[PDB]
Amino acid sequence: SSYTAAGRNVLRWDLSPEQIKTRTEQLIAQTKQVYDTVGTIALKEVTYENCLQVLADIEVTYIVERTMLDFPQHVSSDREVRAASTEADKKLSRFDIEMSMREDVFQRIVHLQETCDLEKIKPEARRYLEKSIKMGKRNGLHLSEAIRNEIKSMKKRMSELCIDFNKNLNEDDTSLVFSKAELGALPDDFIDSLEKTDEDKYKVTLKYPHYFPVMKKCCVPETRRKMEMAFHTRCKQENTAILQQLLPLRAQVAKLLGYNTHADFVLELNTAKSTSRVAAFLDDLSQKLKPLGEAEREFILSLKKKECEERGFEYDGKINAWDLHYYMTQTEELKYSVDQESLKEYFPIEVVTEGLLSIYQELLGLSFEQVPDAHVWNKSVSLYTVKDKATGEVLGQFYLDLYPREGKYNHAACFGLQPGCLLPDGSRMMSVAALVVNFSQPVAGRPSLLRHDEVRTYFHEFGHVMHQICAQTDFARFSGTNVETDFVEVPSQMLENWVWDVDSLRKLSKHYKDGHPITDELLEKLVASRLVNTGLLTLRQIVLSKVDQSLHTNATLDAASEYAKYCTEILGVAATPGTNMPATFGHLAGGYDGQYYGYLWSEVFSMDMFHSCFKKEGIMNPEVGMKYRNLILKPGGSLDGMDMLQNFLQREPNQKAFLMSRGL
Ligand SMILES: C[C@H](NC(=O)N[C@H]1[C@H]2C[C@@H]3C[C@@H](C[C@H]1C3)C2)C(=O)N1CC[C@H](c2ccccc2Cl)N1c1ccccc1F
Numbered sequence: 144s145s146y147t148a149a150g151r152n153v154l155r156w157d158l159s160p161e162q163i164k165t166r167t168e169q170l171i172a173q174t175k176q177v178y179d180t181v182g183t184i185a186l187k188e189v190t191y192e193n194c195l196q197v198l199a200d201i202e203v204t205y206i207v208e209r210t211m212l213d214f215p216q217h218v219s220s221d222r223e224v225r226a227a228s229t230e231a232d233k234k235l236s237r238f239d240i241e242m243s244m245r246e247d248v249f250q251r252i253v254h255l256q257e258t259c260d261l262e263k264i265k266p267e268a269r270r271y272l273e274k275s276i277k278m279g280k281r282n283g284l285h286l287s288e289a290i291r292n293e294i295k296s297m298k299k300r301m302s303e304l305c306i307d308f309n310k311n312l313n314e315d316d317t318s319l320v321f322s323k324a325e326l327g328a329l330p331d332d333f334i335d336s337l338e339k340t341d342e343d344k345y346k347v348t349l350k351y352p353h354y355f356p357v358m359k360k361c362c363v364p365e366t367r368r369k370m371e372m373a374f375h376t377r378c379k380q381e382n383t384a385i386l387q388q389l390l391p392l393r394a395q396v397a398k399l400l401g402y403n404t405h406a407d408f409v410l411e412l413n414t415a416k417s418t419s420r421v422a423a424f425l426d427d428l429s430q431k432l433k434p435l436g437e438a439e440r441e442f443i444l445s446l447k448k449k450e451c452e453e454r455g456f457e458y459d460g461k462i463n464a465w466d467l468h469y470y471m472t473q474t475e476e477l478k479y480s481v482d483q484e485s486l487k488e489y490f491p492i493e494v495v496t497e498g499l500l501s502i503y504q505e506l507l508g509l510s511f512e513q514v515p516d517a518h519v520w521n522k523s524v525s526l527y528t529v530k531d532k533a534t535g536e537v538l539g540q541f542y543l544d545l546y547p548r549e550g551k552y553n554h555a556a557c558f559g560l561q562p563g564c565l566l567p568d569g570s571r572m573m574s575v576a577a578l579v580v581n582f583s584q585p586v587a588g589r590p591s592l593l594r595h596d597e598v599r600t601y602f603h604e605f606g607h608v609m610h611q612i613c614a615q616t617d618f619a620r621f622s623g624t625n626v627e628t629d630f631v632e633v634p635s636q637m638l639e640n641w642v643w644d645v646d647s648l649r650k651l652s653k654h655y656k657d658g659h660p661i662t663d664e665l666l667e668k669l670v671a672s673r674l675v676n677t678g679l680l681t682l683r684q685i686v687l688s689k690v691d692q693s694l695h696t697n698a699t700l701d702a703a704s705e706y707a708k709y710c711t712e713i714l715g716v717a718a719t720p721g722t723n724m725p726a727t728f729g730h731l732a733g734g735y736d737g738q739y740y741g742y743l744w745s746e747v748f749s750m751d752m753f754h755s756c757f758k759k760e761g762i763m764n765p766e767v768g769m770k771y772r773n774l775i776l777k778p779g780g781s782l783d784g785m786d787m788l789q790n791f792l793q794r795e796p797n798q799k800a801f802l803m804s805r806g807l
């Protein structure tokens with residue numbers, strides 16, 4: 144029955160470190176047997192059934208069992224359990240590298256593609272075939288046993304380099320000391336939170352919750368100059384030496400695999416296809432954003448002439464790198480004047496939850512229902528069952544993990560826990576997602592309360608949840624959010640547009656003391672502040688995108704001298720002499736190198752689908768809402784991103800609604 148939820152979630156969240164250890168050993172041994180069975184099938188004897196189907200069946204089985212093993216490390220309250228889960232994940236990733244080089248299994252399905260008729264199977268089954276083979280050729284399984292052994296060795300070193308790149312940055316404990324006057328305009332809240340030293344000064348570390356208040360609030364420009372120099376010289380000379388190995392290594396592995404650059408290797412699985420497509424996209428957007436950034440630099444500079452005159456400071460006549468977050472925060476509090484704290488009194492969390500669940504149910508045609516006596520990894524976690532309003536089909540379930548505790552993931556995320564694919568016995572699996580965020584912890588005084596940028600995160604992360612749950616595919620590889628990486632953030636960013644709508648904000652806002660709405664003047668101050676500092680904030684995302692694209696196109700360039708080049712040519716705010724920002728850029732050694740363009744790439748598509756389709760036909764209209772559910776969310780990764788796009792807009796998308804978003 145695809146019309147109940149009973150029996151369909153049996154994920155266990157109370158596993159002991161011993162249970163995790165042994166389930167990990169048993170899953171590796173059992174999955175290996177299937178690979179082993181396939182790889183010794185005579186080529187005369189292979190079928191769709193005994194190669195491609197047994198591979199898909201073990202892939203679903205692998206994914207679900209893995210979730211019980213690698214997810215406790217992110218949400219559990221027992222440290223011994225989070226540690227078994229971290230070790231399981233390491234041991235299971237060791238197993239995946241091993242499986243990625245199984246040429247015996249790769250040879251069996253190349254043969255199947257060679258013989259069997261491609262037009263007597265399902266289009267998605269054809270896709271599972273073609274992309275499993277493309278997978279093995281992107282690992283070089285079709286190549287000789289000699290460069291493969293060398294490619295294997297080269298990749299194990301990239302792994303070491305990437306580990307050490309971030310381990311360096313995380314083991315850093317660089318601090319400056321300051322006085323109460325050298326920390327001007329910073330709140331008593333922030334300064335009471337700081338340690339004091341033996342010469343009775345205030346210790347400010349270089350970590351994110353210390354660095355960013357100071358750069359945004361401190362009225363002493365020399366304190367800002369010192370903190371920015373320290374911030375962008377973190378692991379300066381040792382992470383430069385890692386990039387000098389890692390980036391040419393990516394160029395070399397890619398050329399062995401038949402790709403010109405590492406960026407080309409990455410982009411093949413993306414909707415932007417090529418490096419020149421990305422390059423022109425990024426270049427023709429800075430030419431677009433140029434006079435808007437010329438206007439913003441002009442205004443910020445005049446704020447600085449004003450300020451230095453009043454405070455008794457010298458005026459150099461530039462916006463330095465340690466001056467930008469300061470006067471952008473002034474711009475936010477001078478032009479647009481939204482108190483982001485008297486506004487947070489209007490968003491209590493019972494109300495935001497209830498009216499976010501209201502919007503999506505009405506828009507997509509769904510029915511959410513909380514599970515009573517629910518198995519959970521924590522007491523504070525809820526469970527909802529998701530139905531289709533018309534049929535009563537149970538599509539899936541989402542957990543809501545809202546509040547911060549020790550051991551918990553401290554970023555916002557949607558974890559897919561179960562794929563909405565087919566099961567080996569012909570049946571359908573229920574989708575299971577987890578919304579994991581850290582909204583401000585409830586204290587016995589008032590209700591827990593949300594800032595507007597927290598409502599924006601709630602909404603962003605719930606469209607991932609709906610993408611995961613509404614998706615229905617035949618194979619687990621295409622299930623849920625498993626689309627292109629420059630497309631994963633379209634269903635998320637598109638629904639952020641709702642928290643910038645007047646009518647919709649009223650469904651979320653209710654003062655926690657009576658229940659009188661936000662007034663009209665405040666609601667209008669709000670949605671007018673959508674494009675504060677847009678130019679200089681968007682030009683700085685392009686700088687980082689041009690940087691990520693450059694180091695994976697020409698690996699013979701100084702990373703710091705490229706960052707300097709883009710900072711002055713695109714941003715208009717110069718990189719500081721002596722700094723090395725790319726040596727602190729954790730994305731280059733995170734999993735998404737060559738992929739930074741894809742968050743501006745994805746905004747254009749969601750701006751098009753919102754302005755040309757939703758804003759036009761009514762943004763709560765359940766006919767655009769069902770067409771969005773069916774032609775974007777439902778097919779998952781079983782169709783291409785630009786095809787799902789054109790089935791909806793009924794045309795190739797353009798940047799017009801994106802330029803009209805920013806106001807150009
Ligand atoms: C890196 C690894 N690559 C291959 O296994 N490549 C083979 C070789 C190269 C091509 C062709 C053939 C199948 C696949 C793709 C051999 C991989 O993707 N793994 C590791 C086991 C699991 C899996 C993948 C595919 C089918 C079944 C399973 Cl259990 N899968 C996996 C791991 C973590 C999460 C989700 C997953 F799905």
Ligand SMILES: [Zn+2]
Nearest residue numbers: 603607632635
């Ligand atoms: Zn996201």
